[PDB]
Design a protein around this motif. Sequence first.
Motif, short mmCIF file in Angstrom:
data_model
loop_
_atom_site.label_atom_id
_atom_site.label_comp_id
_atom_site.label_asym_id
_atom_site.label_seq_id
_atom_site.Cartn_x
_atom_site.Cartn_y
_atom_site.Cartn_z
N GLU A 2 0.94 -1.08 -0.11
CA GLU A 2 0.02 0.11 -0.06
C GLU A 2 0.70 1.17 0.05
N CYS A 3 0.19 2.39 -0.12
CA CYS A 3 0.90 3.60 -0.30
C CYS A 3 0.28 4.62 1.00
N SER A 4 -0.05 3.82 1.86
CA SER A 4 -0.38 4.41 3.22
C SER A 4 -0.03 3.78 4.44
N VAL A 5 -0.19 4.26 5.46
CA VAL A 5 0.05 3.56 6.98
C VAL A 5 -0.79 4.40 7.78
N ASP A 6 -0.85 3.75 8.99
CA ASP A 6 -1.77 4.05 9.98
C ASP A 6 -0.85 3.98 10.95
N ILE A 7 -0.78 5.14 12.05
CA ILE A 7 0.16 4.99 13.20
C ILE A 7 -0.70 5.82 14.22
N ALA A 8 -0.80 5.12 15.49
CA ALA A 8 -1.31 5.58 16.60
C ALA A 8 -0.33 6.21 17.72
N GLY A 9 -0.75 7.14 18.15
CA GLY A 9 0.27 7.92 19.21
C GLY A 9 -0.61 7.71 20.46
N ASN A 10 -0.43 7.36 21.70
CA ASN A 10 -1.39 7.06 22.87
C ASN A 10 -0.88 7.92 23.79
N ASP A 11 -1.53 7.62 25.14
CA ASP A 11 -1.42 8.25 26.29
C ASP A 11 -0.37 8.06 27.00
N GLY A 12 0.53 6.94 26.73
CA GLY A 12 1.73 6.60 27.32
C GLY A 12 3.07 7.13 26.83
N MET A 13 2.65 8.25 25.90
CA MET A 13 3.54 9.02 24.97
C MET A 13 4.52 8.16 24.11
N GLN A 14 3.80 6.96 23.38
CA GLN A 14 4.47 6.03 22.35
C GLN A 14 3.78 6.02 21.17
N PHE A 15 4.30 5.90 20.02
CA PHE A 15 3.70 5.75 18.78
C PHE A 15 4.05 4.17 18.74
N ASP A 16 2.89 3.53 18.21
CA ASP A 16 2.92 1.86 17.96
C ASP A 16 3.84 1.26 16.84
N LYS A 17 4.20 2.24 15.91
CA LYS A 17 5.30 1.84 14.81
C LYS A 17 6.70 2.60 15.08
N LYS A 18 7.64 2.02 14.93
CA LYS A 18 8.96 2.73 14.94
C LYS A 18 9.74 2.61 13.43
N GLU A 19 8.93 2.14 12.47
CA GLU A 19 9.40 2.29 11.27
C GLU A 19 8.38 2.33 10.17
N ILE A 20 8.37 3.25 9.28
CA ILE A 20 7.60 3.32 8.11
C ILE A 20 8.18 3.40 6.87
N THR A 21 7.98 2.38 5.97
CA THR A 21 8.73 1.91 4.61
C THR A 21 7.83 2.53 3.63
N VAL A 22 8.20 3.35 2.95
CA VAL A 22 7.58 4.06 1.77
C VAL A 22 7.87 3.13 0.42
N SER A 23 7.18 2.53 -0.36
CA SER A 23 7.54 1.72 -1.37
C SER A 23 7.72 2.83 -2.65
N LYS A 24 8.78 2.43 -3.25
CA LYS A 24 9.00 3.47 -4.66
C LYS A 24 7.90 3.25 -5.57
N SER A 25 7.00 2.14 -5.70
CA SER A 25 5.94 1.94 -6.46
C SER A 25 4.88 3.22 -6.39
N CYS A 26 5.09 3.86 -5.17
CA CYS A 26 4.00 4.92 -4.96
C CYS A 26 4.34 6.18 -5.44
N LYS A 27 3.55 7.06 -5.95
CA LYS A 27 3.63 8.55 -6.16
C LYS A 27 3.34 9.60 -5.13
N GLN A 28 2.47 9.13 -4.44
CA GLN A 28 1.92 9.90 -3.14
C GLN A 28 1.78 8.86 -2.02
N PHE A 29 1.95 9.16 -0.92
CA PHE A 29 2.10 8.24 0.26
C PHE A 29 1.10 9.13 1.39
N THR A 30 0.22 8.20 2.06
CA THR A 30 -0.49 8.95 3.12
C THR A 30 0.10 8.54 4.51
#
Length: 129
Positions: A2-30
């Motif tokens: 996909e050319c999008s990713v979901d990432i949550a930031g929570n109340d314990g001051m943490q994001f659930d993802k540490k790495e987002i990988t953007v494919s070069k097949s994407c022209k736009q990324f969300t």
Amino acid sequence: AECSVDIAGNDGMQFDKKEITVSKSCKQFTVNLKHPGKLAKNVMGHNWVLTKQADMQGAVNDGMAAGLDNNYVKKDDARVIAHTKVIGGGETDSVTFDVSKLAAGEDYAYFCSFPGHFALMKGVLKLVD
Ligand SMILES: [Cu+2]
């Protein structure tokens, strides 16, 4: 892939993802940032900001100075490739950028620039395939 990713930031001051990988097949990324959890924006607000690895601390320190009503991002700050708004418990925000603003070979940091959040809420975005 996909050319999008979901990432949550929570109340314990943490994001659930540490790495987002953007494919070069994407022209736009969300990136869709959602904040599960119940604290208000004023105490545990979160945004997602994308800068090159070396420009991060500059962007954080000038962001701090910019205020909530600027979403803790210096207006027209040249270093920030993409950023959401500051959201609180129960909200979502989304940002879409051109994958063409990224150079493979370069590494990128994504972080939250809400005061002092960068110390836990930080990760790397990289171009893939
Ligand atoms: Cu935050």
